[PDB]
Amino acid sequence: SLELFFRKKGESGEPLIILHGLYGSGDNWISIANELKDYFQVYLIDQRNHGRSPHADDMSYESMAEDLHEFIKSQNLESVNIIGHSMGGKTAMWFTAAHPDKVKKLIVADIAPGKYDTTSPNVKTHKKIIAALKSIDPSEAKTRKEIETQLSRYIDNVQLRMFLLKNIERKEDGCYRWKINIDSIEKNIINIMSGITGIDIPVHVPALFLKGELSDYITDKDIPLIKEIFPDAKLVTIPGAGHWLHAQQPKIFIQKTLEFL
């Protein structure tokens, strides 16, 4: 169990914990928390190996769930709302099944409870990203415009590029560095892509699955297992959004969130 870095927006309302996905941080949720903080006490958490949170070798969902559980303890929160995007969504589902009594309502953004295999574009895209990151040497200390043009050759989508490049920071010597534990990430890719198993089903917590229309992280074969774990779950497709649906369609993200919580 690590002590997670967090920022809190909002002084009144029920607590609302937001968990980013792989390579993200609480910073990517600033604009959504900007609206949500009028109604909730929003906690933007950096998960292990991410943002300003501590590094570790193990990044299993068990450990990330425990990090979450410890965070909730150290802040004296009785019961919480949770939004988890992708990797953050699996942690949240793990945590919720293990501790349903601490969760008021759950929002899962664009990921299914089950395992993704190597043929999947999920696994493929992650495999690419890792290779890209492992192959950039930040220590060479070239300016952040150079790192950008280096990643220009690897992945095309500019949003993905700058998404990833939010993870490069300045160090004390002046040389650039990754703030994320790329090594732990790489040696946990199986852990990260694995399905939820070994849980007391059904989970008696209201849940919302938000699917991006142009993403295939959730498909129609996912509905059976979603419903097995969360019988009264609701599934909602945000039109014209991919995997980062809250960055691409934030207005609709807030709408669906405020109608559910």
TrEMBL record:
Record-given protein name: Esterase
Organism of provenance: uncultured bacterium
